Design an enzyme around this catalytic site. Sequence first.
Site, PDB file in Angstrom:
ATOM      1  N   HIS A   1       0.864  -1.178   0.000  1.00 21.07           N
ATOM      2  CA  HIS A   1       0.000   0.000   0.000  1.00 21.07           C
ATOM      3  C   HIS A   1       0.908   1.239   0.000  1.00 21.07           C
ATOM      4  O   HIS A   1       2.123   1.097   0.069  1.00 21.07           O
ATOM      5  CB  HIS A   1      -1.027  -0.002   1.179  1.00 21.07           C
TER       6      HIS A   1
ATOM      7  N   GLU B   1       0.830  -6.600   8.469  1.00 19.79           N
ATOM      8  CA  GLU B   1       2.112  -5.942   8.710  1.00 19.79           C
ATOM      9  C   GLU B   1       2.665  -6.537   9.984  1.00 19.79           C
ATOM     10  O   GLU B   1       2.008  -7.348  10.631  1.00 19.79           O
ATOM     11  CB  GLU B   1       1.901  -4.443   8.931  1.00 19.79           C
TER      12      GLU B   1
ATOM     13  N   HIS C   1       1.483  -5.644   3.220  1.00 19.60           N
ATOM     14  CA  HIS C   1       2.296  -4.617   3.824  1.00 19.60           C
ATOM     15  C   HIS C   1       3.791  -4.760   3.610  1.00 19.60           C
ATOM     16  O   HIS C   1       4.260  -5.776   3.085  1.00 19.60           O
ATOM     17  CB  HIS C   1       1.993  -4.599   5.316  1.00 19.60           C
TER      18      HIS C   1
END
EC number: 5.4.2.11
Lengths: 235, 234, 235, 234
Positions: A8, A86, A181
Amino acid sequence: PKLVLVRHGQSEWNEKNLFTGWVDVKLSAKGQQEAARAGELLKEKKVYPDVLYTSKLSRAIQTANIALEKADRLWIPVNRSWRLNERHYGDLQGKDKAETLKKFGEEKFNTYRRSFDVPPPPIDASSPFSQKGDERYKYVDPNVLPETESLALVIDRLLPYWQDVIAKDLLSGKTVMIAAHGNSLRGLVKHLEGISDADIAKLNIPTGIPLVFELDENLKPSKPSYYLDPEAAAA
Amino acid sequence: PKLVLVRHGQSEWNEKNLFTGWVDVKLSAKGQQEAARAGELLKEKKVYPDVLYTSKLSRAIQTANIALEKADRLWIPVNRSWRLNERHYGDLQGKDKAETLKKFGEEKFNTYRRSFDVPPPPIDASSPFSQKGDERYKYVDPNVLPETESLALVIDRLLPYWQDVIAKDLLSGKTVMIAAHGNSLRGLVKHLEGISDADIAKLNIPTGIPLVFELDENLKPSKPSYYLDPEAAA
Amino acid sequence: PKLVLVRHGQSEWNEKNLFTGWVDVKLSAKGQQEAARAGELLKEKKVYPDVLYTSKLSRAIQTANIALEKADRLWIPVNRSWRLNERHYGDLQGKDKAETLKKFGEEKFNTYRRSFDVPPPPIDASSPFSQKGDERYKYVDPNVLPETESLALVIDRLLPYWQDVIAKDLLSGKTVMIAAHGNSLRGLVKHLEGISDADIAKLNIPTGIPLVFELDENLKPSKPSYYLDPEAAAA
Amino acid sequence: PKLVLVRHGQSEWNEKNLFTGWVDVKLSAKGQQEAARAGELLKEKKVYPDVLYTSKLSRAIQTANIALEKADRLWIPVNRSWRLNERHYGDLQGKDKAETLKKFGEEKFNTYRRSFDVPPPPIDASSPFSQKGDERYKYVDPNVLPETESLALVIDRLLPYWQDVIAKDLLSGKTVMIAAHGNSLRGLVKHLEGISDADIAKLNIPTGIPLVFELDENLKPSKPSYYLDPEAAA
Ligand SMILES: O=C(O)c1c(C(=O)O)c(C(=O)O)c(C(=O)O)c(C(=O)O)c1C(=O)O
């Protein structure tokens, strides 16, 4: 097979300089654009996702959404897993990045940011930046949910979803898109390229540029990985 | 059980006066503003979708992705099926609504639009607006894929999904949000509410407003449906 | 694509001469053997099922279990569905067929038994041979579940599972084995070959003999269906 | 959350004195008898599984098939995974246990059989006793498919399927029946009750007897486990 990874872009908390980890932070206005450029780069550069895999953190999900909107494959299958998430930042979750550099002094701060195996201290179950008991993690063994983590760990937990889940699709011939992530994609790429423990520290996966790995049956690169926009990934 | 329906807002062809059906038209900037307004009403009205079912049409999928973003439920699981698609429009796909009226007249025009059993005319196999062969329907029995449809027909192909898939979840105590199209939802509201084959035509579903149905253990409304904004619904 | 169809051997009721329909009647000793016979025939003529489909009636489940053990292919994915069930016999469920012949007359017995669209009367919810509210059907819309059925009605509900669920496997290159019951399998062969409503009643499908179907992109058959034992089949 | 564990009985190989491991050896007569007894025991003690998990080895799939045929729950959903498999015996697979002892000796044989972390030597893919490339494992990352194993390792590959897949159903509210093997089930039991690295050898899981667990919201025991036959167990 073919695989496309996509980190992202900037998030709401990323411009406020706060550590994110698992806090379900939104995707900044800028992060929505880098999303669209990935979409457009998919369409443009002719990579075509038969199935999608995201994490359960909205910044990741929102990225695929916007990207697939621009590539016109909004209709492809969708799976999510905490294993694509993440790294968890523990105590360090929702703490000012620069305010933390001063309390720990450059060395402790950096080991926590870029070491392969040292995790920030765990977070309290009572903290407001704690996900202990979050609704999107309600059908997972409560015992396995971390309260902190490191690259090392992140990989210990991502691997099993890759081994069983994301791999059926690859060996089934499908073209997989993963939108996750920073730490989790570096972790996937390490497993992939064979990089040493010492070495993974040096890998940056530039945000918003999809990276295509063409793999063989043994799920190992056919040729070396190509970003869909070279000078952008290298700059 | 709690069920939520969301009719996607305007598309790029809703602006052009073109009959869409299954053509995969995109939400207009206005459609997007509408999708967002729906997610906000879900949030504001404390209606919390545990799972999502869309159609295989982008304008519907875009609405889901925008609405659940304003609701923060962008993580809930999501399934897709051509059976939630809007009524295939047959030949009339890729054509002007006003030109079609100057051609077939008021009556044949209405019939193609609101007759229950009367389907528009079958679309030529090799036409620019036909989805025969679309990558998104390559794992469905080729013979069941419609060359055209009527609300009657649409419901024949929707019912099974509702019966085996959407119900598994509703009957597991999950809150199911469905984002599809006008006729597919028209189809399902008829079935849920026992509306007559003659009376269904007069039903419209306001775009961008979530119809919430509070179903009982037999998947029947335990009380009447309420939009999370019934005044903008009048 | 390739499809194998297996009609099960006699149940403990087809033995005492009873109508079964949806009664979860247990397979008989004579039929478990026909299950085994089924097994050696898949192995013998090298027909290799990569995925299995059955219904929720124990007589069909048992048949495939006993059969894939003999084919050495126990391990494959397995999907069960009420839609692959046998035709619901309504009020005839649990009643001696001969008493039923004199309780109605030959014309109304021929209708209830071999017509295409005239279903038997419905079985009351209280009657001990009703499946209403039975646990294995608890995640299915309460209103769709029949109280009596015709071959026509059986095709109507069979088709959606075949079109969405079974086709996906078939169209993905997997050899699909379906172990179910008479009417449902016939309901299905009527489709595959365009058999007319008028003629459907004539079609038999022996028990314990696998009907294999070589299909094409259109799931229309490529060449005449064949039994892996044409003699005991055509016999 | 109610979980039921079922070890399978003597396979063809448990009589011929050979290490089986990942070899898809079929169950024998007594093996097929004890499975039916596990099924009868379940019905008797009124333990009704809502869904089934099995390994990918025939011997345990057969146990489930026979046990559930005897329980009347033939129809419950069925899920399978290689992570529920028996411990790989590497280069001891297909070999006779007494002749194994003549090659390694008491110490090194007791170690390859009962240490927690020392795996038997690996097996070369070329051997007719290596599952590398077996069809039933063509959709799992090839790299993870063990060419030997230890109980430590069994737990490591198993846990993630428990964590994500088995637990979803247990947490959803269902009664889960697993039908695996000695290692994988002892490896699971070690985790469920906190049995120590050096204490787990002592744990025997009788074959053919179902072991029930009563788990709390944390999938930790609510009360001490129990066999539906506390007599045949010890
Ligand atoms: O999607 C359509 O084109 C449509 C619309 C629409 O403009 O959104 C309407 C409408 O007027 O709201 C109607 C309607 O009559 O309510 C229909 C209708 O014919 O079903 C359609 C359509 O073309 O399906």
